[PDB]
Design a protein around this ligand. Sequence first.
Ligand SMILES: Nc1nc2c(ncn2[C@@H]2O[C@H](COP(=O)(O)OP(=O)(O)O)[C@@H](O)[C@H]2O)c(=O)[nH]1
Ligand SMILES: [Mg+2]
Length: 170
Amino acid sequence: GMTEYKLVVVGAGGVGKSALTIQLIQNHFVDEYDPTIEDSYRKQVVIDGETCLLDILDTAGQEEYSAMRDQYMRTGEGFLCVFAINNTKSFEDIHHYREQIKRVKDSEDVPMVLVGNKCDLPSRTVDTKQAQDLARSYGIPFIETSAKTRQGVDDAFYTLVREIRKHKEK
Ligand SMILES: Nc1nc2c(ncn2[C@@H]2O[C@H](COP(=O)(O)OP(=O)(O)O)[C@@H](O)[C@H]2O)c(=O)[nH]1
Ligand SMILES: [Mg+2]
């Protein structure tokens, strides 16, 4: 039968992890969602003719115990690494997320997609070239998104599934 995949959405507080996840799951933009809530959601989709069940963890940062962070990174099969295009610190944080996930999984080959969110807002500080160069250095896709307009949202999640499939079918 069909397969379930564990996706994990990571990134600095305020980049739009919850807004992106809720758009995919519930098809609306949520303006105020408590930044300290971490929850998971299921969604069945068909990608490349094959039916999937996505189990998506919307992370929120520090855990009661760091061992719990390590556990969700170990069971996670692919990671949406989200920054906001108007927040340079959130982009620099991607370096740390890439390192930490590889470190916890003790692996050099971890499915990931780099997501630059909030493209509909003014005063961008992270240029597309910067992000394209970084994703290229990791060997992963880069997608620009807006949780408000839905630009790129489905693309980002479905591309991550394709990356998971490529890793498993190696
Ligand atoms: N304009 C705009 N605002 C966004 C976008 N994504 C998130 N936000 C806003 O950014 C703030 C933080 O988003 P949230 O989903 O809570 O970020 P999280 O802490 O990563 O889960 C909220 O006020 C959201 O409405 C976007 O693509 N465009
Ligand atoms: Mg959140």
